[PDB]
Structure 1
Amino acid sequence: RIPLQIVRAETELSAEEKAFLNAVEKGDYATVKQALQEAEIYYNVNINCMDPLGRSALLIAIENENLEIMELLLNHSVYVGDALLYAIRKEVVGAVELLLSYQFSEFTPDITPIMLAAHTNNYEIIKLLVQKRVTIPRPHQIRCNCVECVSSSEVDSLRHSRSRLNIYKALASPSLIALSSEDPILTAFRLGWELKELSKVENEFKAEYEELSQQCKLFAKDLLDQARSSRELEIILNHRDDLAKLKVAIKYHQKEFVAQPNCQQLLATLWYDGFPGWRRKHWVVKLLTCMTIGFLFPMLSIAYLISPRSNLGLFIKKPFIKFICHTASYLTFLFMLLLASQDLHVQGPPPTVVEWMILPWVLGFIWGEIKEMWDGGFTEYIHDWWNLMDFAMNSLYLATISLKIVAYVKYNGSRPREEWEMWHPTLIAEALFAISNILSSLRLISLFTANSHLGPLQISLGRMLLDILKFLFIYCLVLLAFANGLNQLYFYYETRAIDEPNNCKGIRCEKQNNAFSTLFETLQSLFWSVFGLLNLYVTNVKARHEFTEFVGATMFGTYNVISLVVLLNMLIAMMNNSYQLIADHADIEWKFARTKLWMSYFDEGGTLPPPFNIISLIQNQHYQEVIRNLVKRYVAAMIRNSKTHEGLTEENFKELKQDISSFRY
Structure 2
Amino acid sequence: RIPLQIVRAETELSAEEKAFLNAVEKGDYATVKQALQEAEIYYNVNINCMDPLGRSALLIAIENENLEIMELLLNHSVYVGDALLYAIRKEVVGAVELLLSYQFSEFTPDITPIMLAAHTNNYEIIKLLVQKRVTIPRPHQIRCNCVECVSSSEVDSLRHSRSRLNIYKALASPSLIALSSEDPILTAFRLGWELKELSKVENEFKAEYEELSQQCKLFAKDLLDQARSSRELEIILNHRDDLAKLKVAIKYHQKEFVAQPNCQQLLATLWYDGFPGWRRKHWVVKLLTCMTIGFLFPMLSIAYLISPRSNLGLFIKKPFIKFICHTASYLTFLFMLLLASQDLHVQGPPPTVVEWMILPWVLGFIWGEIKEMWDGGFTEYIHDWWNLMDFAMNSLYLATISLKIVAYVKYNGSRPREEWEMWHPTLIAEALFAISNILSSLRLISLFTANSHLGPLQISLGRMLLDILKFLFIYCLVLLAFANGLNQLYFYYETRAIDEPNNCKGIRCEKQNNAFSTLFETLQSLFWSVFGLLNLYVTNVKARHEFTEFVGATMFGTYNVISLVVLLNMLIAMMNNSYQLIADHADIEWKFARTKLWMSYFDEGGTLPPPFNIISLIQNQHYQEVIRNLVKRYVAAMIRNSKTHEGLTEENFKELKQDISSFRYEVLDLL
- Give the TM-score, by structure 2 length: 0.96
Instruction: Tell me whether 238-247 or 640-649 shows the greater mean CA deviation.
Output: 640-649
**Which string of whole-angstrom CA distances, capped at 9 and with x for unpartnered residues, describes residues 117-148 of structure 1?**
01001111111111011000011101111011
Structure 2 counterpart SS, 1:644:
coil
Shift in CA distance, 283/664, structure 1 to aligned 2, threshold 3 Å? closer
Deviates more, 1:137-146 or 1:22-31: 22-31
Query: Measured at CA, do residues 158 and 647 of structure 1 come closer, stay the same or move farther in structure 2, by a change above 3 Å?
Result: closer
Displacement, 1:288?
1.2
Question: Whole-Å Cα distance in 2 between the matches of residues 456 and 600 of structure 1?
Answer: 19
Cα displacement (A) at 1:375: 1.2
Cα contact 1:345–1:416 (8 A) shared by 2: yes
For each residue in 1:85-129, what CA deviation from the matched residue of structure 2 results, as whole angstroms up to 9, or x when unmatched? 111111111121111111111111110011000100111111111
Alpha-carbon distance between aligned partners in 1 of 2:650 and 2:609, rounded to the nearest angstrom: 70
Once the two structures are overlaid, the 10-residue window that deviates more, 291-300 or 204-213, is: 291-300
Shift in alpha-carbon separation, 1:315–1:643, aligned structure 2, 3 A: same
Q: Deviations over 1:343-378 (max 9, x none)?
A: 112111111111111111100100000010111122
Moved more, 551-560 or 25-34: 25-34
Which protein has greater RCO, CA pairs closer than 8 Å, 6+ apart? 2
SS at match of 2:96: helix
Matched, 1:94 2:98: no
1:25 CA displacement = 3.0
Please give the residue correspondences for 1:192-231 in structure 2 after superposition, counting only pairs within 5 Å. Answer: 192-231=192-231
User: Aligned-pair distance for 1:18?
Assistant: 3.9
State the partner residue of 1:121: 121
Going from structure 1 to structure 2, the CA distance change for 1:646 and 1:298 (only over 3 Å counts) comes to closer
- Call closer, same or farther: CA 1:150–1:650 in 2, change over 3 Å: closer
The answer on whether the counterparts of 1:346 and 1:413 sit within 8 Å (CA) in structure 2 is yes
Mapped contact 1:373–1:381 kept (Cα < 8 A): yes
Q: CA deviation at 1:651?
A: 13
Question: Structure 1: where are the runs of 5+ without partners?
Answer: none
Q: CA deviation at 1:500?
A: 0.8
Question: 1:27 deviation in Å?
Answer: 2.5
Superposed CA deviations along residues 256-282 of structure 1, whole A, max 9, x for unmatched, are 111111111111111111111211212
8 A contact 1:482–1:559 mirrored in 2? yes
Question: How far apart are 1:46 and its partner, in Å?
Answer: 3.0
CA contact (8 A) 1:18 1:49 kept: no
Displacement, 1:26?
3.6
**Aligned to 1:481, what secondary structure does the other structure show?**
helix
3-state SS, counterpart of residue 497 of structure 1: coil
1:617/1:498 Cα in 2 relative to 1: closer, same or farther (>3 Å)?
same
CA shift for structure 1 position 409: 1.1
Deviation at 1:17, TM superposition (A): 4.0
Distance 2:630 2:184 in 1: 11
Greater CA deviation, 644-653 or 454-463? 644-653
CA distance in 2 between partners of 1:181 and 1:488 (Å): 70
Residues 659 and 18 of structure 1, relative CA distance in 2, 3 Å threshold: closer
Question: Residue deviations 1:51-73, cap 9 Å, x none?
Answer: 11111111111122111111111
C-alpha separation between the residues in 1 aligned to 2:632 and 2:282? 44
Hey, what's the Cα distance between the residues in 2 that align with 1:456 and 1:63?
50
Q: How far has the Cα of 1:654 moved from its partner?
A: 13
CA-to-aligned-CA distance 1:283-336 (integer Å, 9 cap, x gap): 111111111111111111111111111121111111111111111111111111
Distance in 1 (CA, whole Å) between partners of 2:611 and 2:648 is 72
| Residue-by-residue CA offset, 1:241-267 (whole Å, 9 max, x unaligned) | 000011000111111111111111111
The answer on whether the counterparts of 2:304 and 2:314 sit within 8 Å (CA) in structure 1 is: yes
Distance in 1, Cα, partners of 2:664 & 2:35: 27
Distance 1:233 1:574 in 2: 42
Distance 1:9 1:656 in 2: 35
Q: Distance in 2 between matches of 1:591 and 1:312?
A: 31
CA drift at 1:204: 0.4
SS across alignment from 1:498: coil
CA distance in 1, matches of 2:214, 2:12: 50
Paired residue secondary structure (1:651): helix
Q: 1:581 to 1:652 in 2, by over 3 A?
A: closer
Determine the C-alpha separation between the residues in 2 that align with 1:23 and 1:414: 113
Q: Give the whole-Å Cα distance in 2 for the aligned partners of 1:550 and 1:581.
A: 45
Taking a change above 3 Å as real, the CA distance of residues 473 and 650 of structure 1, as seen in their structure-2 partners, is closer
- C-alpha separation in 1, matches of 2:96 and 2:419: 97
* 1:658 to 1:448, Cα distance in 2 relative to 1, 3 A: closer
Q: Percent identity?
A: 100
CA 1:124–1:73 in structure 2 vs 1: closer, same or farther (change >3 Å)?
Answer: same
Please state whether the residue corresponding to 2:536 is helix, strand or coil.
coil
Cα offsets for 1:504-524 (capped at 9, x unmatched) = 111111121111111111111
Matched residue SS, 1:574: helix
Change (3 A) 1:664 1:132: closer
The answer to whether the Cα contact below 8 Å between 2:58 and 2:73 also exists between their aligned partners in 1 is: yes
* TM superposition shift of 1:419: 1.2
Cα pair distance change 1:373/1:13, threshold 3 Å: same
Gaps of 5+ in 2: 666-671
Equivalent residue, structure 1, for 2:27: 27
SS class of match (2:510) = coil
Q: Distance in 2 between matches of 1:238 and 1:374?
A: 26
1:205–1:660 Cα change, 3 Å = closer
Distance (Å, rounded) in 1 between the aligned partners of 2:600 and 2:417 = 47
| Cα distance, 1:532–1:633 mapped onto 2, change above 3 Å | same
CA distance in 1, matches of 2:609, 2:281: 28
Contact 2:28–2:662, Cα closer than 8 Å, also in 1: no
Cα distance, 1:21 vs structure 2: 2.9
Q: 1:424 to 1:194 in 2, by over 3 A?
A: same
Give secondary structure in 2 for the equivalent of 1:277. coil
State the partner residue of 2:358.
Answer: 358
Give the direction of change, closer, same or farther, for the CA distance of 1:629–1:649 in structure 2 (3 Å limit).
Answer: farther
Query: CA deviation digits over 1:430-485, x for unaligned, max 9?
Result: 11111111111111111111111111111101110101111011000101111111
Query: What SS does the corresponding residue of 1:499 show, helix, strand or coil?
Result: coil
Q: Residue 16 of structure 1: CA displacement?
A: 4.3
Tell me how far apart the structure 2 counterparts of residues 543 and 338 of structure 1 sit (CA, whole Å).
50
The answer on whether the counterparts of 2:64 and 2:654 sit within 8 Å (CA) in structure 1 is: no
State the 1:645 CA deviation: 3.9
Q: Indicate if the aligned counterparts of 1:348 and 1:404 stay in contact, CA closer than 8 A.
A: yes
CA contact (8 A) 1:456 1:590 kept: yes
CA drift of 1:23 comes to: 3.3
Which deviates more from structure 2 when the two are superposed, residues 345-354 or residues 192-201?
345-354
Q: TM-score, normalised by structure 1?
A: 0.97
Structure 1 residues 43, 270: CA separation in 2 closer, same or farther (over 3 Å shift)?
same
Is contact 1:396–1:432 with CA below 8 Å preserved after alignment? yes
Alignment: residue pair count = 665
Rate the CA distance shift 1:396–1:652 in 2: closer, same or farther, 3 A: closer
CA RMSD of aligned residues (A): 2.4
Structure 2 Cα separation of the partners of residues 52 and 164 of structure 1: 34
Cα deviation, residue 557, structure 1: 1.0
Give yes or no for contact 1:189–1:217 (8 Å, CA) kept in 2: yes
**Is 1:522 matched up with 2:522?**
yes
Q: Is the 8 A contact 1:456 1:589 kept in 2?
A: yes
Instruction: Give the conservation status (yes or no) of the 8 Å contact 2:27–2:658.
Output: no
Measured against aligned partners, the alpha-carbon deviations of 1:188-238 in whole angstroms (never above 9, x if no partner) come to 000000000100110000110000000000000000011111111111110
Partner secondary structure for residue 170 of structure 1:
helix
Displacement of 1:659 in angstroms is 13
